[PDB]
Design a protein around this ligand. Structure first.
Ligand SMILES: OC[C@H]1O[C@@](CO)(O[C@H]2O[C@H](CO)[C@@H](O)[C@H](O)[C@H]2O)[C@@H](O)[C@@H]1O
Length: 355
């Protein structure tokens, strides 16, 4: 890598790994549209397996960017509309509180207080219907944002219904395959287990547990190379040959709601660039309800934006950020769920230096 990139990356990440006691980490920097890779430490401490460019990390909530783009692709295909009532795709969802809740609200966490987590006890399709029928919103739709897997997770499940495909098959056929993300998975095949890093929580090796709507909300595993390809695809949607996928990426980066200096897209979140780390900045808060202002109509993807998404699972911490106008981006994958502010600070330090 150019010495400038090598130096800012190593000088930023080495201390981060030391301070946060991260077992293993992979970073990709996209500079002038070309990727540069860096790896440190261990994917499996006990078996002494190093992190490599082929190591699979759990993406956690960064998975929601794939769900948002798959949804965008379904809108582009004419299969669904964000303005459509949730009940159009799930007629059995007859409880009155669902009147007025559209797919847009599900995708952007504005349905009225859907919870962060789908309960453990909810597994089957009948259990899930019961959970949503019983849910009581705290707020009217489109008034407050509360980040939630049960919200964007339901959006993903409904968005693929008209296609006839399972969520995993739709994601594979419509997103992963066209973009050549051939080492990105919702379910890690046995052939790829040799590359699946262990996550570490309180020093114990752990992998994400199955749960309802996991694939749609937090279940993607990927390598640093495929994630760099994902950032390039989101930096330059026009180089993508598949027409509806190109549009879908664009729709996911549209600004639908504003809270403070932040704008909510489909999966992706955005701030106007330039921005300071203090404004970009947090997982220390378990539930953060914020009023939202609708952007009527949504602003098409703004190139001068800091576009990003954090992700965590019990044993992993991920972060992706890119600035379209500068053809610049970064992916940070780690097998420890360490504080979001430290991720944002490192990413900002690196991208600001490469401006
Ligand atoms: O398996 C749970 C799964 O949900 C996430 C969010 O996608 O974590 C939430 O639930 C955990 C278990 O209840 C909490 O410890 C965590 O703080 C909460 O965000 C993922 O992190 C996790 O893989």
């Amino acid at each position: 890598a150019p010495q400038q990139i090598n130096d800012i990356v190593h000088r930023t990440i080495t201390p981060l790994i030391e301070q946060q006691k991260i077992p293993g980490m992979a970073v990709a920097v996209i500079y002038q549209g070309k990727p540069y890779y860096f790896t440190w430490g261990y994917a499996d401490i006990a078996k002494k397996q190093p992190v490599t460019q082929q190591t699979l990390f759990e993406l956690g909530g960064v998975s929601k960017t794939f769900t948002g783009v798959l949804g965008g692709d379904a809108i582009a295909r004419g299969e669904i509309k964000l303005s459509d009532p949730t009940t159009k795709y799930w007629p059995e969802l007859t409880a009155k509180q669902w009147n007025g809740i559209t797919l847009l609200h599900l995708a952007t966490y504005t349905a009225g207080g859907l919870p962060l987590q789908v309960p453990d006890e909810v597994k089957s399709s009948s259990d899930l219907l019961r959970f949503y029928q019983n849910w009581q919103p705290a707020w009217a739709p489109g008034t407050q944002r509360l980040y939630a897997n049960s919200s964007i997770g339901l959006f993903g499940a409904l968005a693929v219904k008209p296609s006839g495909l399972s969520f995993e098959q739709a994601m594979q056929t419509r997103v992963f395959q066209p973009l050549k993300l051939n080492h990105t998975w919702i379910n890690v095949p046995p052939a790829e287990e040799k590359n699946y890093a262990w996550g570490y929580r309180e020093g114990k090796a752990v992998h994400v547990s199955p749960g309802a709507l996991d694939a749609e909300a937090y279940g993607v595993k990927s390598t640093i190379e495929d994630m760099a390809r994902w950032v390039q695809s989101n930096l330059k949607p026009l180089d993508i040959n598949e027409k509806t996928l190109q549009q879908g990426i664009q729709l996911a980066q549209s600004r639908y709601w504003q809270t403070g200096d932040m704008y909510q897209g489909l999966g992706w979140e955005m701030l106007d660039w330039p921005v300071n780390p203090d404004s970009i900045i947090d997982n220390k808060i378990a539930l953060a309800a914020r009023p939202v202002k609708a952007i009527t109509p949504p602003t098409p993807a703004v190139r001068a934006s800091w576009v990003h998404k954090t992700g965590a699972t019990g044993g992993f911490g991920s972060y992706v950020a890119f600035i379209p106008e500068k053809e610049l981006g970064i992916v940070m994958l780690a097998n420890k769920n360490y504080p979001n502010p430290a991720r944002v600070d490192a990413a900002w330090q690196i991208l600001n230096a490469l401006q």
